Symmetry: D2
Amino acid sequence: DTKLTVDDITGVVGIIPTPSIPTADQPGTAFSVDLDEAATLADAMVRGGVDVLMTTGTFGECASLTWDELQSFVATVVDAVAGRIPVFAGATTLNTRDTIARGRRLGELGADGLFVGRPMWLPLDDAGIVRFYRDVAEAVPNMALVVYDNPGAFKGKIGTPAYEALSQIPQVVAAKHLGLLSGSAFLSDLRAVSGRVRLLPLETDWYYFARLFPEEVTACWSGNVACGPAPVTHLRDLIRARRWDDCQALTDELEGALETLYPGGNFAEFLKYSIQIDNAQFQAAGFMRTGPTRPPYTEVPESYLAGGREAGKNWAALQQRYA
Amino acid sequence: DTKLTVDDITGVVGIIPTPSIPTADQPGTAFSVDLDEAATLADAMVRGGVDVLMTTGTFGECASLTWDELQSFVATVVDAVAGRIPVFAGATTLNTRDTIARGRRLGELGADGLFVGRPMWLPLDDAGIVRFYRDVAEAVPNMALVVYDNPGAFKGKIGTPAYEALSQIPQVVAAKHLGLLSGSAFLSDLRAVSGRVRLLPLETDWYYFARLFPEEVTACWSGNVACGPAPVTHLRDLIRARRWDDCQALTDELEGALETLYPGGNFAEFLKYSIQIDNAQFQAAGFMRTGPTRPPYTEVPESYLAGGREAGKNWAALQQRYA
Amino acid sequence: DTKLTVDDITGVVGIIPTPSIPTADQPGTAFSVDLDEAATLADAMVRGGVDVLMTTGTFGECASLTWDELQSFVATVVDAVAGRIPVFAGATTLNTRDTIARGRRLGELGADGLFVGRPMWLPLDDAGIVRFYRDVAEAVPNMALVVYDNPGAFKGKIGTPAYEALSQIPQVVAAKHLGLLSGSAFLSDLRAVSGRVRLLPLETDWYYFARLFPEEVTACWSGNVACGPAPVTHLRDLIRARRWDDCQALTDELEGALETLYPGGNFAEFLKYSIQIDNAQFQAAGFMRTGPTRPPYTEVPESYLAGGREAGKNWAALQQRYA
Amino acid sequence: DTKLTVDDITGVVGIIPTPSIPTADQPGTAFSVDLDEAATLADAMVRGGVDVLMTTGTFGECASLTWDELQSFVATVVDAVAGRIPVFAGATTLNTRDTIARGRRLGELGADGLFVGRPMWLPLDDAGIVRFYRDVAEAVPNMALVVYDNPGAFKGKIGTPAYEALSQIPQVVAAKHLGLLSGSAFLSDLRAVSGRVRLLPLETDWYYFARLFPEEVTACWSGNVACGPAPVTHLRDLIRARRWDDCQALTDELEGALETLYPGGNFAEFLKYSIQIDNAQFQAAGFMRTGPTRPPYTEVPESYLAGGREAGKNWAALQQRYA
């Protein structure tokens, strides 16, 4: 089995998008990954202090990359990271067997673990959710697993009873969580895993949960590191120092920079177009370069992209200040 | 260009499940299709008078079959039908380019058309829905298309403006529709396509739309033909003869047989476990043989299977009556 | 018991709004009903061929009228009708005992029956729905009842099992229903009542149901009669004559006139401001005069009002065409 | 204007149910309040150390009491409290003018403030919410106001822009909130009111917000005090002493006692029958005596009541321990 345990998931779990070439929004484009930018981006996350790197969740366009793009992208990221920090390759398909087959191959390319959502053509209940992760874990026992708890994408919030059983699977070392967006669930799920799984809130509410549960909530995830990771690594140091006033001030800065991300403040509307909106944010922040999104997620109200671009520009100023 | 048009879609559009072997619920099973049963079932549909055959929608486990299994199953169905009726192969993936790649291959294997859902990791608005089907049609112009309008599966009902644009695509010959389960929408969508696309209601409300719109609503779709097609082909013959009193009596018989399908009449709840519940119905009806469902959709409340099996046994009595 | 039965509910069931004085939108206005307009409107409905008159449903502002305003309005309407057609007074409160007490008084003022929603602070389940209507029926056995099946307003669609039990209550003579807006349910409910309750669809889909069930669906409700009742009474006459082609053409004209009612075709958005939008339609149609809406439903996007105004103008043209 | 300000809302804001007589579930019962029990309950809350008392929210059956019942119950509570703590009378009707009329009378009967939901027949947008409360404030300026933010009851969560406007109304001194049940909303609303309104979380998550925002979140509301207030006033003393480990332990004890309230852990299922389930909890805890619920909220599954009863028994053990 894997050597990675919950103890290895600390600090900033950075999630990067997949850089794209200018024709990436055309169905006739066979290979749309900018591998040069993928390598420089992954290296910049390491040099920027990111503690764990993950690829190809929702905004990384796990849904819309071909298999050849995904494996080549992951291979490039793994090679650029060069063993400096753990790398979890995002592997999510419509069924258990395809996910196992992808995950086996991604492990063979040097990924240290798998960042795994679940099939969503139909929703899975807690019984089916647990069965799915147990199946993946037993089939690829060498890979650590980060559970992808995205209620909107996968048609349901993972139940606290499911978290109890998932914490008995040794391969499950962390879960990407919604934090306060799921409300009371984070705290219930936290008790359920009983320190056996690192529950990752967003960096915008890491401080709240870390102050309340400092020995357990020692890590966050951030989908913003590709806009500049210095605000999030600075938050990690402030939390370690238990500098709560500064943690609160910085959390307000982070939330203020992302204020325009959700159209009219509506979260559910943002999720309908999250791939497109995040793509505009990554372009505008200027920390990395990337083209358009892949088919079919190329349509979006223009005002939503404006919100994303303003969030990117505001985060760029935070990156400049804290670099 | 495909030679099929809307005029070719008349009568019973039967949708079959994918027969499974006894170990089909195990993640280690490399190939889980019962090809012998697939061929006999496809032949029984033709001999039973089904007018158009489709495979691998939701209950056909499009989500959970491997690519190898889907090709083999469709090739076996195509061979067994032997050109007697048009065969539409269900091809739905997480993105446009994989769907195109699969659709090309399935056409190479002899399918006459594709039964196409749409990517659902994120929802698609009407613009993204139109662009998706336009991309598919332009890339595979030799395949006719049946649009799969499943709001629960694909996270949204197809809008009337999208149906207007879809009816301008020559390859789009039909749409699998919810009928009265989207009460006002079927009529709005029917006007939008203005005779260019066959809008398929369920067999349980075909009579209602046929009597009101005799020149346009000349076909239905049925997910129950693998329990015995005789009640559905009989309904088609009653409708063609405009035997409205008999149509109402038969429609009542179909509804009463399927009454227990939805747990507590709760439709949305049946959507959560439709693969599992329908599988139990196909087993109980006796017309075909099949094993369990494929991972990950193996978990279901026991009493939900009770409703499926009683629906299968009820349907079996109708098949014996009308055969 | 009431001498009114299901047999008496045939033709056009017209629902009128509550005419208001110019200062009706002010919380300091103690009495905001234009009683002169109420009398002339009620008389115009009778002379225009309306078969049954109902008051104070949702757009009649049952929620926002004071108890003194409701008594005076109903008494004025009852006196104006002067026994020419049955009058159903809208009585809906937050609980069973207030509704009973209001209903007894409205019967004393001469109403032939009560048009009754249900308490909605908490939703009622089917047992609670039946218990509520049974309590009302038992407390005022002299009054016929029209069930108000408004899923949005009362937090739930009335279940088919509830309809089965309600059809055993002799006072329950009709139900104001959704028609194709909950298509499958209308047919389920219709079988459930087995002719003992008149299920009223909207005038915009009455033709469809009346052709399929000529013995059962012999009446509709219309919230548009206060814009001019001639198009709807003409539809009644066409249905009686089985002039299906003309029925379809007239249905298309009614839908065309009401097209702009729903903001960007979004029905759910219309429900958010239905009182305000309907008020604009009544003003613009010119068949009656009324002031603004009562507190608290005075806030509404201006563009939404413009859609209601255009629908009122479009309807006034139909009224002119068919008067 | 009222002399109560946000500064006076500190500690435990106790909400009591309305004690009922054995025949309270019959629609023929003219008056169903146990006024003797209400007086002793109110006095027990003062003696138990509750800092602010409120009546007739949802579980207090604000919907189903008659106006005469509400007047007499509030008058009894006010007299028994005898000015020792502030009393907020729950007054929520279907419209602005009835609520204003009720609120003025409840002020004449000695209530210090009004605990006010909002009309819900139609949902109110943020503009409508603000106009309603402003109307109430301007019409009865002698009464302080507690805003009742119950999304399920009133068809929507109060928006952050509405809270900003509400915080400029002097009469608005507190808002009964959902705490972690509306995750990030609590903190957004907290920033919006900027110390001018006391945002009341639940007893079960007060510790978390109080530790993070000790200057602002100095009070909670509790619907459990009529089972015994000693656990809640102890939590208040623990928070004031910043005994965080004890606060966490006590919070876990409160959640443990209440876990059987929700059938199968399903929150939404509890809300459908909250009046009935809470009533069973109040009876079982034995701190107060009460009969059944009022029409129409008398129908409920027996197993749901059993879950409330064990919650009541479990709370009674906490009450004895901390008393």
